[PDB]
């Protein structure tokens, strides 16, 4: 979402440092899922857990997670919403129910729901201010970050076909 704005932020970031969210997910399956990334083996994206139900068709727990920004740099936080090909696929992965995701901060609030009918992951992003807490509410179809990002030193994001 707002892909160009986000891309530009990275283009001038100076580079990315990573830091764990510190999120413990008891009772939630976070195992490799997609074959699409077979190049490194059959697994999901390296740093973002799908948070599938512990077993197929099982209900997803209503989770509340919160992350306080420990540092003086704003945190770039990304989360995904999984759009299934069909209702049956969503049910298998996250159980039956009205899937709703809410993300909140001191200056942000947005709700999301997946729309079945096409396989896709929608990534959404937020810049979290220092001393603030990002609150997440999960009802399933939420691909959670394991780590967040911090920016270091004003890079130049060039798009080019030339050799180095």
């Amino acid at each position, epitope marked *: 979402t707002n892909e160009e704005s986000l891309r530009q932020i990275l283009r001038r970031s100076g580079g990315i440092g990573k830091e764990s969210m510190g999120f413990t997910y008891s009772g939630i399956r976070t195992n490799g899922a*997609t*074959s699409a990334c077979t190049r490194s083996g059959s697994s999901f994206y390296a740093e973002m857990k799908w948070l599938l139900s512990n077993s197929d068709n099982a209900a997803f727990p209503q989770m509340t997670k919160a992350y306080r920004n420990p540092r003086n740099k704003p945190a770039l936080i990304i989360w995904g919403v999984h759009h299934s*090909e069909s209702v*049956s696929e969503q049910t*298998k992965l996250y159980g039956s129910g009205n899937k709703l995701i809410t993300v909140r901060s001191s200056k942000y609030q947005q709700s999301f729901t997946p729309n079945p*009918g096409a396989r896709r992951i929608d990534f959404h992003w937020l810049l979290l201010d220092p001393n603030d807490t990002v609150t997440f509410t999960f009802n399933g179809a939420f691909i959670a970050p394991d780590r967040t990002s911090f920016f270091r030193g004003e890079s130049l994001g060039v798009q080019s076909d030339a050799p180095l």
Partner: nanobody
Amino acid sequence: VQLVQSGAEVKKPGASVKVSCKASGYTLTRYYFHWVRQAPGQGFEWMGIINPNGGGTSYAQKFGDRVIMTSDMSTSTIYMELSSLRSEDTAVYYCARDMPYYHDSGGPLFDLWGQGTLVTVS
């Protein structure tokens, strides 16, 4: 190489049935799959077609809104759901892998057939 199907099932009228077929070997995106009924000593009846490339479906009016087909690319499964079961639905259900040969009519060419699943409603 193969299409294999779930075991025979018994259902009560008004209930739903799900019939599964698994594909081994070739990818699913190269073929269209059809469901065809083998009525118990009667001729074949076309139920519908599913295109795994995007899950698009089309159904014969004889079944109309009673049938929902869907596919699972991660497990290679083509399972079909039939709603509002009637005693007339007792039959052997086949999954067929149809090669897109008849470009003139979109007609099916049944290259490979599944084992067949017997569904009994009563």
